[PDB]
């Protein structure tokens, strides 16, 4: 039906937003790891 | 040395993760309608 | 309708793939938190 | 200091990731039969 | 029309699946990055 | 001690993430056309 097609379209849109939210997560995980590398190189390495 | 604190970025990731979970619930709700 | 049913099944599987990824991201947070806590409670006292 | 050991958490992440790959394989299989 | 809307949906899902596979690749490499931080701490900081 | 540098692998994560964004762009475009 046309209703079932519209529903499947709505479902895939919601699924795509879920993936966009996970993409945002990955972007911030890169930043968190980079901040750990920075802290190590800017503070622990010289102390030792 | 002063302590590392990445709690702010980790909170952002947790927030994005929670938002992702709701969109998946919404997708499955729509499929439940078929 | 048989194709509508298969598309529904496909999106259902995609959604499960995304739930599995959500669980991986959940544990990546735990992993990074664990590195922070080890630096602070084991290296930084030194 | 004892050394850091996050193999347990890394193993969990790997398992979730492998299971994700299989769900995508199943989705694509359904799509191929359309 | 029906098989065209059906064919567009099928391709939208194929695209979404490839988005998820790229996220899977990024998570694979995040594991590597985090393990590298673990390995560097145990070979350069914990002996040192 | 030699600094820790994970820029190579971080660049690989970035690249996968930019590809992911393009597939989602393409998925949305297809849905817009229905």
Q: If we measure between CA atoms, which residue out of A34, A31, E48, F4 comes closest to residue C43? A: E48
Token digits of residue C33: 């938190």
Token digits of residue B21: 């979970």
Instruction: List all chains that touch chain D, counting a touch as 3 or more CB pairs closer than 8 Å.
Output: C, E
Alpha carbons A26 and E30: distance in angstroms, whole number: 9
Contact B1 C40 (CB under 8 A): no
Confirm if A15 and B28 have CB atoms less than 8 A apart: no
Q: Of B9, B19, B26, which is closest to A32 when you measure between CB atoms?
A: B9
How far is CA E38 from each of CA A33, B12, C32, F23, rounded to the nearest angstrom?
11, 23, 10, 33
Resolution, expressed in angstroms to one decimal: 1.9
Confirm if F28 and A18 have CB atoms less than 8 A apart: no
Alpha carbons A5 and A26: distance in angstroms, whole number: 32
Contact A18 B16 (CB under 8 A): no
Alpha carbons B22 and C24: distance in angstroms, whole number: 17
Query: Terminus-to-terminus CA distance in chain C, angstroms?
Result: 67
Residue in this structure with the two tokens 């302590």, named with its chain if needed = B3
Alpha carbons F11 and A30: distance in angstroms, whole number: 9
CB contact set of C10 (below 8 Å; sequence gap of 6+): D27, D28, D30, D31, E10, E13
Question: What are the helix (H) ranges across D1-34?
Answer: 7-32
Confirm if E2 and A3 have CB atoms less than 8 A apart: no
Query: Terminus-to-terminus CA distance in chain D, angstroms?
Result: 59
CB contact set of F5 (below 8 Å; sequence gap of 6+): A37
Residues in chain E with CB shorter than 8 Å from the CB of F5 are none
Q: For chain D, what's the residue count? A: 34
Q: What are phi and psi of D5, to 5 degrees?
A: -140, 95
Q: If we measure between CA atoms, which residue out of C40, A45, C45 comes closest to residue E40? A: A45
Q: What is the DSSP letter of C45?
A: T
How far is CA C31 from each of CA A39, B1, C25, E4, rounded to the nearest angstrom?
17, 22, 10, 46
Residue in this structure with the two tokens 């947790």, named with its chain if needed = B14
Alpha carbons C21 and F25: distance in angstroms, whole number: 20
Alpha carbons B9 and C38: distance in angstroms, whole number: 18
Alpha carbons F34 and E5: distance in angstroms, whole number: 6
Q: If we measure between CA atoms, which residue out of E7, C19, B29 comes closest to residue A13? A: B29
Alpha carbons E10 and D28: distance in angstroms, whole number: 10
Confirm if E10 and F33 have CB atoms less than 8 A apart: no
Confirm if C19 and B28 have CB atoms less than 8 A apart: no
CB contact set of A34 (below 8 Å; sequence gap of 6+): F10
Contact E27 C25 (CB under 8 A): yes
Q: What is the sign, positive or negative, of the torsion defined by CA atoms of D4, D21, B22, F26?
A: positive
Q: If we measure between CA atoms, which residue out of D24, A7, F22, A25 comes closest to residue C15? A: D24
How many other C-beta atoms lie within 10 A of the C-beta of residue D31? 21
């Amino acid at each position: 039906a046309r209703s079932d097609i519209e529903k499947l379209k709505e479902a895939i849109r919601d699924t795509n937003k879920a993936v966009q939210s996970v993409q945002s997560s990955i972007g911030n995980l890169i930043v968190a790891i980079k901040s750990v590398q920075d802290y190590v190189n800017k503070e622990i390495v010289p102390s030792i | 040395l002063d302590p590392i604190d990445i709690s702010i970025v980790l909170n952002k990731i947790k927030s994005d993760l929670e938002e992702s979970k709701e969109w998946i619930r919404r997708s499955n709700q729509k499929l439940d309608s078929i």
